[PDB]
Design a protein around this ligand. Structure first.
Ligand SMILES: O=P(O)(O)O[C@H]1O[C@H](CO)[C@@H](O)[C@H](O)[C@@H]1O
Ligand SMILES: O=P(O)(O)O[C@H]1O[C@H](CO)[C@@H](O)[C@H](O)[C@@H]1O
Ligand SMILES: [Mg+2]
Ligand SMILES: [Mg+2]
Lengths: 334, 334
């Protein structure tokens, strides 16, 4: 008896020109001709009955979610009145479980190719959840001082493979993040969580009452009642709202390869640089990532660059600047 | 009276992806809505009759030249059976003039916007030719240690702006070029020439017998006789064949703006770098030259780059590597 809560992700802005302007990243078909969301759903269905899966998402994306995920019952798509970030989404989705029921909370727009190792780790977390309670995170070994992740300080070994969390720090500044990675005492928050419904609801009561007092009585399926509640409700992530403040966080180490697919460089990391061919010509150019559309692309005198050609536009991006495609979209659709 | 010889060698590898094998550089409408050659022709027609204009070019470009230059008689286009650079084209075109007729020799693929100052300079050269004899060049004031140009050392002043050439040095290396520009005593060779027909021909006898012996008696309007004769003729520019060796080179200073339009960078130099707009989005990118086709182009974290989008393909080039675009064509040509 478990529920799985799939959270709509944010914008596909950093994947321009593949991405149409406001389209959520979770709909991108970056691999195997299926959306990030679809692969996520299929990973969940490996062990779960679709009736036990909830997608909490903005109302605009409901119809396309139905289409991506025909196996999901319609009643299991909770349409949000507006974008309030993950804490209110978590709350309303979690409220649909029984008090004593675990809820696996998953972003829609990550990539985890080994679905068996994924479930291996989730089963270890479920067993640990039974023994220790608390809010469970899944930690990845950090390879860089990334400033858009949360950092989980590994605390006392509850048992082999499962630790308390000395502290949770969401999106530290660069110099803080450097020191974390350099200490060896931290893992990256993979952005997925596990908790028993009741226990998370009470942590929100304590941690962020503004959400709890307004949603506690709300029927998530009744849009009108949700819309009124959500206006009184603050926009904030679960990480800041709850994780950074809770006294009972636990971490398990991820048994699996993972990515949040932050930008075009994330994609290159997975597929590799592009080789020369009849469509990709490289003269004095190393470490290029090129996606051709309908014609040859030649790159001369430049290394460490991303070139993406689609009917919507062409991006030519110095690798280390891949985050700034956000700014391209700001200028293009203002 | 006077002959004009337009040399149409049909380079264009460096203007990929705009140029093609069938549309070399001289046919590109880079400026205005006319080709480089057409502007050149119109420049010449400001003072001369089409009857007195000769185009020397590879057979493959002949019918397109006729379309480009409809005022030119069909016999004023001399079809070359194969490319052998400027020295033999010079010889065969100059053979069509009478012995003491001046021949004005012009590249088809350069750009000189001020046609009146052009002719001011040419008339000054004709006056000097009539007084002093010899082979005339048109010298441009250098602004950089360009290694692809010939350099003309300024000798004794015969007349205001008319000098004997003390030495002509074709395509010196970077160090030497630097010293020539630093000295203040050298002009760039513009690739244009003026001579009396017989004097030039005789000058090739001494300087490059290989060209004179095999072409002296050949009628350039006999394609079959010309094909034979061309087989034994070296491929060599007039600058290496004759200008570096002759003891009777004169130079006139150019009263006018000129460019050889060597590569895409040369076009930017004329038109300027590209402004941000609805179709050119620039994020942390300075000094970019972008030509769009049908969609927006974004350049992120990159400066001093050239990006050309055409139906035939996309070029992305670091500016200082503009010359190596030719290798793209070589690579697509197997
Ligand atoms: O909402 P965001 O910016 O995508 O961050 C969330 O996901 C990260 C992993 O993708 C985590 O590292 C963060 O802690 C957080 O849970
Ligand atoms: O063969 P190239 O590369 O076109 O060089 C010729 O033209 C140059 C001017 O463009 C001159 O600078 C050279 O001296 C030569 O006349
Ligand atoms: Mg996220
Ligand atoms: Mg030339």
């Amino acid at each position: 008896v478990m529920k799985a809560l799939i959270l709509a992700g944010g914008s596909g802005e950093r994947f321009w020109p593949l991405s149409t302007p406001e389209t959520p990243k979770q709909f991108l078909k970056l691999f195997g001709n299926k959306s990030l969301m679809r692969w996520t759903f299929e990973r969940v269905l490996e062990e779960m009955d679709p009736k036990d899966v909830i997608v909490v998402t903005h109302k605009d994306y409901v119809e396309r979610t139905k289409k991506e995920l025909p196996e999901l019952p319609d009643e299991n798509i909770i349409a949000e009145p507006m974008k309030k970030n993950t804490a209110p989404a978590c709350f309303i989705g979690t409220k649909l479980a029984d008090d004593d029921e675990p809820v696996l909370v998953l972003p829609a727009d990550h990539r985890i190719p080994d679905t068996k190792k994924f479930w291996k780790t989730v089963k270890k977390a479920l067993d640990a959840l039974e023994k220790y309670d608390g809010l469970f995170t899944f930690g990845i070994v950090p390879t860089r001082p990334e400033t858009g992740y949360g950092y989980i300080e590994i605390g006392e070994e509850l048992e082999e493979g499962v630790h308390k969390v000395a502290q949770f720090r969401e999106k530290p500044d660069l110099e803080t993040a450097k020191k974390f990675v350099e200490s060896g005492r931290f893992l990256w928050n993979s952005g997925m969580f596990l908790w028993k419904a009741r226990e998370f609801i009470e942590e929100v009561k304590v941690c962020e009452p503004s959400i709890y007092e307004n949603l506690k009585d709300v029927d998530p399926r009744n849009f009108e009642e949700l819309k009124k509640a959500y206006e009184k409700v603050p926009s904030i992530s679960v990480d800041y709202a709850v994780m950074e403040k809770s006294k009972k966080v636990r971490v398990v180490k991820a048994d699996f390869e993972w990515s949040d697919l932050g930008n075009w460089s994330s994609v290159r990391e997975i597929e590799g640089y592009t080789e020369e061919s009849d469509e990709v010509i490289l003269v004095d150019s190393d470490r290029v990532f090129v996606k051709t559309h309908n014609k040859p692309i030649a790159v001369v005198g430049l290394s460490d660059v991303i070139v993406i050609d689609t009917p919507n536009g062409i991006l030519i991006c110095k690798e280390e600047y891949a985050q700034k495609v956000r700014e391209v979209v700001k200028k293009l659709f203002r």
